[PDB]
Point group: C2
Chain length 391, copies 2
């Protein structure tokens, strides 16, 4: 609604687009603030011409050129943009000498697998005073590359979002950004060298609110450090060291974490008790693909403000006493007033059982509106058929 998104397939289509862009009537646009030409293959002059047209359109503040075959020479052209504050250059061919306008507030370089992370972090440290969001996902970043962030002269002082997913960052690298107090959102996922020591070194970051640490070799000492931080959203998926004790006995319950993802962590029903006890504000909860049973699910449902719960791909029913226990879980779900959605995919829970969870016509107390990712409105007929088309 505030974006134009087009793939321009030929040079001739590019000229047609540029013609449309150059129309004087566009100079005043404000509703359209982002242009996405991802997958378009440009020449240098086409790109220079794009820059010239955009420079007459102050209202366009965001430009996406993902997968456009862009090279370092292309970034030189793009650095001449005078109104663009957000620039996405994912999946291009940037190498050791790209250049960026210092006015940029967001820069995405994800999946530039020929990128020199050393040069980029060096040059951004010397120039990027305005930069708030930086993504170097899968750009080959090592701890040594991050050391430029500790330079006294470094101008990278306004960063609030830093995506370092799937590089090789360790606990030593965390020390390189632990003084950047403006950080609120960090993705460190798929950096297996982080570990509990890395998590511990995030402590001085007092404004950190959103933290992605999936696949980071996190164990009990890590989740303990996390419990003591004022975080709001935490992804700890694919950390099966968390299958052990968490050591939370002398830790006050955390009341700030609202979203907690713990999929694929080999957790059991005893961990469910810890979650509701020590993370009582975690009301958006994903514990899919763990070792929990109906007992653990009911434990999670005892959180009186639980609102979205994913317990999928865990066996909750296996097809007479087994039917009772399953029924007892279904009742618990129904009696959980605050629950807005539940995911029970691949749990063994049948079509008839799912149907019985749908709030009866004009039920005023239950808040459940989504099951297995489908609204209850669109799920009920879909289910009733699958039941009717069995008999």
């Amino acid at each position: 609604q505030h974006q134009v998104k087009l793939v321009l397939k030929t040079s001739q289509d590019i000229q047609l687009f540029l013609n449309a862009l150059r129309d004087s009537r566009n100079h005043g646009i404000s509703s359209l603030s982002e242009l996405d030409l991802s997958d378009t293959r440009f020449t240098n002059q086409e790109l220079s011409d794009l820059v010239t047209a955009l420079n007459n359109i102050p209202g366009i503040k965001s430009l996406r050129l993902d997968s456009c075959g862009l090279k370092d020479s292309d970034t030189v052209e793009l650095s001449k943009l005078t109104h663009i504050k957000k620039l996405s250059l994912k999946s291009n061919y940037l190498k050791n000498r790209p250049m960026f306008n210092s006015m940029l507030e967001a820069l995405y370089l994800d999946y530039n697998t020929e990128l020199s992370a050393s040069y980029v972090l060096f040059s951004l440290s010397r120039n990027a005073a305005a930069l708030k969001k930086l993504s170097l996902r899968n750009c080959g970043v090592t701890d040594a590359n991050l050391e430029y962030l500790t330079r006294p002269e470094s101008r990278l002082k306004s960063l609030t979002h830093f995506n370092l997913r799937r590089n090789n960052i360790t606990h030593q690298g965390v020390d390189s950004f632990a003084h950047l107090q403006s950080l609120t959102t960090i993705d460190l996922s798929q950096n297996t060298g982080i570990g509990d020591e890395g998590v511990s070194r995030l402590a001085p970051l007092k404004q950190l609110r959103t933290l992605y640490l999936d696949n980071c070799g996190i164990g009990g000492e890590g989740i303990k450090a996390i419990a003591k931080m004022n975080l709001q959203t935490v992804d700890l998926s694919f950390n099966p060291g968390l299958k052990k004790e968490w050591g939370l006995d002398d830790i006050r319950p955390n009341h700030t974490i609202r979203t907690l993802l713990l999929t694929f962590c080999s957790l059991n029903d005893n961990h469910a008790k810890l979650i509701v006890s020590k993370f009582p504000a975690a009301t958006d909860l994903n514990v899919a693909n763990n070792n929990m049973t109906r007992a653990g699910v009911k434990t999670l449902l005892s959180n009186p403000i639980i609102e979205n719960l994913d317990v999928s791909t865990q066996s909750l029913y296996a097809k007479q006493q087994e039917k009772e226990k399953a029924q007892d879980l279904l009742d618990t779900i129904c009696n959980t007033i605050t629950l807005k959605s539940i995911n029970l995919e691949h749990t063994g829970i049948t079509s008839r059982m799912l149907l019985s969870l749908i709030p009866d016509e004009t039920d005023h107390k239950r808040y459940l509106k989504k099951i297995n990712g489908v609204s209850c409105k669109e799920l009920k007929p879909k289910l009733e058929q699958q039941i009717a088309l069995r008999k």
Copy 2:
């Protein structure tokens, strides 16, 4: 060369294709043994007509219909194929009642996220005597679903390849297939409930040769069990529990494992010593994204039969004594005769340094032909430019 691959975008294009298929002159084809119509959206009658045409072409033995919007009713039609032995149905909409011809030797159901794994494993256990390859990647499979494989009456007795990547299989589930002695290739990756106990329970599988266990919560006890098996190819990536001791002191070196992937495991230079000592046949080696230094790389290079080595995204050079140490590593690489390829991406090693690794004109002793994924022939000019375009 033995495959026809087409996306048919309209029903009318489907009829044109079917017309071409029905030509009597195709009845004898033998060179084309596989038809891939993935991404095509069929009606029931179009599919029935496809089956009828294929049934007159005995030479086509393999059919791929990935991402074709297929439903259980569609599998009923496909089960009427009389010559097809390999059927790929990835990324479709199969649910709780699909049906398969018992003559199938390979069946791929990857990413059927509405699939009932329980029904499928049950029905395949009762019918699929000929089945050799089965893939249920990301199909919501739990341990409970695998129990059908232990039924006395089970006909799933010829399986050699079993892909269970990204489900929820644990060590208890391994027990369900540990008696299937025909298994040679198993993908258990992204099943974090497996752990060391799961690996230990793979021991009775004496013909197991290829094992994928990336993201399985594996630690030292797991790699020890692996060291004692007659495996040839092992992926242990994303298991940072392997950062600890491996406990191999009283274990004879393993001489069967040739390919060993240990990326993202938080390994250090001491683990490199263990690798060459206890896995001396592992001559295809990937240790990218770990904690190794030049010392560890040189240790890996001391394996006198090393042939492909990936040590990328580990800092090996940081830009005078540092230049010497870097040079010493380059010499070691050059003196490693058997090395065929090396990956040094994102290590800090410069363009001039990479160029100096390329075997001199008509060098007869060195086998190095690929660096950073590029043949030395196509890399040398590419490099020489980047060096010339700096000065």
